[PDB]
């Protein structure tokens, strides 16, 4: 099945690396056994959503397409192969804004930075590392394959837009006219960058590049299938799903129970602009943004606890549902547009949305 | 002239840069300005050495080679955004490296991470920009390039060595044995991973692969001359030059006045695998040694001032004399043999020694 050889490729992907650096790297023994060790904690223990996307694109195509055995086993290993350049990308992404945002938890376990043996001097190396072993296994699995050039390329325009979405994300709270290197930042006291269009913005590129254009696009590439569909129209779906996948993440830093999150959520208290926020500030009468402005992006329990209670007030729960409502539409009209070129790719689509809704 | 060219160049990347953000990644004009005074601030100022190596290879090939005028341009245009890659890929891992060290300044200069306006939060994900916009400029200005697919492999692979030898410089005083994520790492006692084969290790990865290896390999690239050396050649002479850079590097961090040096030089108190270190510890007798591990990785100036005592009285001066002189015979051979294929690529190399030396 989809889920063992994935897993199979993660230990062959390792072996290499390992075996890599001690032939030609003069890596010793025990940093290997560390960066062993930094590549299992960060890498596994999720879903492998991103990762296993790749491999459901890439079987839907070998179902509908005639090819060798020895094809579908290159094909199906090359997936596996990109489905964890994915994961590897998050994993980097991961372990650097844990370190930017002072993280504690995630998943349940402690932050990689926060490990006894690692600490931040080296965690920040370590996320360097997990970055360029995406490229690693790229230049020596695809060396001679005729997608690595759109792959690399592809790769590197998603990598770039996340930093740019973690810029617009750790820029969220302050005032864009005040922004400036030399001058401490003030925290926003007018909320009037707390719109749907910047909360958009945000969302698009610190997550729906990498969590859901690239799997899909990767997924096409390995299978040779680009010309399947119109690249316009999984841009629209990923930006789309992407979007509704960051609204659940939101509603669930403040209302879902710490022991369920896996981690205390922090959205309030770090001033994120979240789509609670901006919804509150949409329906909002004037003693409620006043209440808003005095609680928000405070440390203060009893803050956190004003402000969790306006978005209760508000009937927040009413706007989600018409936002989801709204979502099941559009979604299902990018479905059946895809559904044109590719019925495969469109079921593939399909079961992407299902898992995400 | 050469760093006429150059900079010139930096301008017209940082425009192109800043444009496509603004078509294409929805940047607003704050930010673009964020990012415009991020890039000038991290990657301008210093001596250009790296960069303007790539230029100075190119217009030795360009003497001896037949050319278009056109071509001329166009290959001094590409050795001058190769060039500046390079500087990009610096700057990236000068303002990680300073956030995981802790450091204060660099140049005369506060460290970026301490701005008053950017915070370590911000500074973790400009360095992540910094070396993403080195593909970008990759991608956009080499893309129909026959050396795009050799250089960006090349690009990648120092990337990757550079990251290695951080893992090793970070590590460096901790005793390999005890390495591990799980248990915080207490610094060595025994001080027995302070030889010079270790040494050795730590900087041709950390330093010699992106300061010289890559500057001499980019200029080779862009100019399609690299059938004119023997790539083992350009590799053994690059990681030599390095490593005696590194020697100054080191020697200048305990010696050199912090008004000349730039900054307050904390190698002692870093417990670092200096070469001052390791080439006392190679010629210490027993009270010294003692001496030397009661003082050395403390943060109390009286024990720094103890070790620096330790290396005036041990006369590393004499070491570093006759360590020069052996860097000198091999240069000259190394110099020598790359004289065989082209004399012109073993003249850039004998300047690269000059500006060193
Ligand atoms: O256009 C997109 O949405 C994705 C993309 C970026 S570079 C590249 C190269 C080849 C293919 Cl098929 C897609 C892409
Ligand atoms: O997806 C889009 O709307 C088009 C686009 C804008 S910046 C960027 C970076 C990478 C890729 Cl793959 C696509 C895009
Ligand atoms: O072999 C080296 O030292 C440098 C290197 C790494 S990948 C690559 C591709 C093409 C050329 Cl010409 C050199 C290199
Ligand atoms: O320079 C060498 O001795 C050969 C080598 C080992 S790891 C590595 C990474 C990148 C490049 Cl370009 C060369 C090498
Ligand atoms: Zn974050
Ligand atoms: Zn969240
Ligand atoms: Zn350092
Ligand atoms: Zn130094």
């Known amino acids: 099945a989809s889920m063992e050889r994935f897993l199979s490729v993660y230990d062959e992907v390792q072996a290499f690396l ?9 890596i010793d023994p025990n940093r290997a056994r560390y960066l062993r060790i930094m590549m299992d904690t960060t890498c596994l223990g999720g879903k492998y959503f991103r990762g ?12 509908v397409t005639q090819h060798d055995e020895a094809t579908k086993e290159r094909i199906l290993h ?3 192969v990109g489905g964890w350049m994915i994961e590897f990308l998050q994993a980097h992404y991961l372990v650097e804004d844990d370190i930017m945002d002072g993280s504690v938890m995630r998943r349940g376990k402690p932050c990689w930075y926060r490990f006894p043996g690692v600490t931040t001097q080296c965690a920040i190396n370590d996320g360097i590392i997990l970055k360029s072993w995406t490229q690693i296994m790229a230049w020596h699995y695809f060396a001679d394959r005729p997608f690595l050039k759109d792959l690399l390329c592809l790769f590197q325009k998603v990598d770039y837009a996340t930093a740019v979405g973690q810029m617009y994300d750790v820029t969220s709270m302050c005032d864009s006219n005040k922004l400036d290197p030399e001058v401490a930042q003030p925290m926003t006291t007018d909320f009037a960058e707390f719109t749907p ?3 958009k913005r945000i969302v698009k590129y610190k997550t729906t590049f990498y969590t859901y254009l690239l799997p899909l696009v990767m997924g096409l590439l390995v299978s040779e299938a680009a010309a399947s569909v119109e690249m316009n129209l999984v841009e629209r779906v990923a930006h789309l799903i992407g979007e509704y996948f960051q609204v659940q993440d939101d509603v669930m830093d403040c209302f879902t129970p710490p022991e369920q999150l896996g981690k205390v959520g922090t ?8 789509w609670l926020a901006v919804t509150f500030l949409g329906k909002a009468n004037a003693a409620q943004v006043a209440e808003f402005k005095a609680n928000y992006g405070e440390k203060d329990p009893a803050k956190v606890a004003v402000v969790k209670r306006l978005y209760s007030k508000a009937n927040l729960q009413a706007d989600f549902a018409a936002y989801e409502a709204e ?18 790719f469109a079921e593939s689509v399909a079961v992407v949305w299902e898992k995400t809704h």
Do not use: H, W
């Not at 390992?18 to 003069?26: A, G, I, P």
């Not at 296993?52 to 179902?63: P, R």
């Not at 959205?267 to 979240?274: M, N, R, V, W």
């Not at 539409?329 to 559904?339: A, D, G, N, T, Y």
């Open 18 to 26: 390992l075996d890599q650096l001690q032939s030609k790297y003069e």
């Open 52 to 63: 296993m996307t790749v491999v459901n694109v890439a079987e839907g195509f070998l179902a």
């Open 78 to 80: 090359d997936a596996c």
């Open 197 to 199: 269009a910047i909360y």
């Open 267 to 274: 959205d309030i208290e770090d001033a994120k602009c979240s």
């Open 327 to 344: 979502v099941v539409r559009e979604v299902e009209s990018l479905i059946e547009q895809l559904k044109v070129k590719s019925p495969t």
